[PDB]
Amino acid sequence: AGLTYSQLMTLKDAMLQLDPNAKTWMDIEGRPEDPVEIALYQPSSGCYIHFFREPTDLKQFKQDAKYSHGIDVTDLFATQPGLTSAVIDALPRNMVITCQGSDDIRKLLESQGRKDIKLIDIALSKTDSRKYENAVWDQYKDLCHMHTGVVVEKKKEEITPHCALMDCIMFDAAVSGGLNTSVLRAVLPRDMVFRTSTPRVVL
Ligand SMILES: [Zn+2]
Numbered sequence: 045a046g047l048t049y050s051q052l053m054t055l056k057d058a059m060l061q062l063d064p065n066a067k068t069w070m071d072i073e074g075r076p077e078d079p080v081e082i083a084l085y086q087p088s089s090g091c092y093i094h095f096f097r098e099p100t101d102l103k104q105f106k107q108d109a110k111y112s113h114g115i116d117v118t119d120l121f122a123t124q125p126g127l128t129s130a131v132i133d134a135l136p137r138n139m140v141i142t143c144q145g146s147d148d149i150r151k152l153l154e155s156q157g158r159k160d161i162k163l164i165d166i167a168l169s170k171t172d173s174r175k176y177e178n179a180v181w182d183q184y185k186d187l188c189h190m191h192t193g194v195v196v197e198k199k200k201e202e203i204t205p206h207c208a209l210m211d212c213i214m215f216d217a218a219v220s221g222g223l224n225t226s227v228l229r230a231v232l233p234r235d236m237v238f239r240t241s242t243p244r245v246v247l
Contacts, residue, residue, distance in 0.1 A: 046126035051236060055134050058231050061091050064136035069212035070143050073113040075104060076152040080120060081113060081190070082128060084141075085212035090226035093131060094209050095237040096123045096190065114193030114205035124239045131232075132156040142166060144173055144215045168218055176217040180210050183223060 047055065062068065066088045073081035078100045084093040098120045099105040109115055132153060138160050143149045146165035153161050181204070191205035217223050 047124070047130045047236075052130055052134075054233075055130055055236065058233070058236075059131075059134045059136070061089070061231055062086065062093075062136060062139075063089055064139050067216070068139065068141050069216055070141045070149055071208045071211040071215070072148065072152060073115070073206060073208045074099060074108050075101075076148040076155070078104065079128065079152065080105065080108075080115060081208040082131070083208035083212050084231075085209070085216065087213075087216045087220070087224040087226065090224070090228045091231050092209065092212070092228055093231045094188070095127050095131070095232060096120055097128050098123050098125070109193055110195065111197065112195060112206045113208075114191045114195040116192050119190055119192070122238050122240065124236055127236065129156055132158055135161065138162065140164065142216075144168055144211070166215065166219060168215070173215055173218055174204075176214040176223065177204055177210070179223065180214040180217065184210065184213060184228065187228065 062084075063086065066086050069083075069085040069087070071083050072079045080097050080099050082093070082095055082097070086092070096119075099117065102117065105117060109117075133156065135158065140162045141149065142164050144166050146163045150163055153159070153163075188207050188209050191207055193205070195203050195205040197203050213223070
């Protein structure tokens with residue numbers, strides 16, 4: 045499938061707010077060859093890109109749900125196909141992107157022809173990166189309700205589910221001494237994130 049020419053031009057419209065000279069975090073949930081949640085975050089401006097994708101490898105998705113994102117696969121059946129490839133194509137040229145663990149972000153961008161994107165690796169330890177975790181969830185819990193399952197960590201203690209958006213927000217908080225003052229606003233309209241079908245009309 046893919047996005048129509050009108051959607052691609054609308055996506056091109058929404059991508060203009062991103063300041064290409066501002067700090068931009070990027071995190072994904074799921075493997076880079078088969079991602080299911082993608083998030084970009086500019087803390088200075090408050091603009092964030094957030095959308096989902098149906099997985100190709102169902103066997104690996106179940107493992108990632110048990111030990112990371114805890115997403116029910118049935119909640120990803122109405123996503124817009126091809127949005128990931130289109131958003132990556134529409135990112136500004138030679139944009140610099142910040143991430144905790146730059147390996148998987150680099151693989152996703154190179155697999156989509158965007159070798160021009162510069163990446164900076166913030167190497168924070170596992171428990172250091174998620175110090176603001178409870179504070180980020182309490183402030184922006186209404187921005188993602190997709191994480192419904194119980195996530196555990198092998199040696200089987202239950203943990204908070206990993207969200208691509210909340211990760212970008214809490215990672216920037218760890219290197220900035222706290223949450224940014226800017227209020228978040230979504231770059232992408234909801235009609236492009238979820239392929240919504242016409243419901244039955246009550247006559
Ligand atoms: Zn999420």
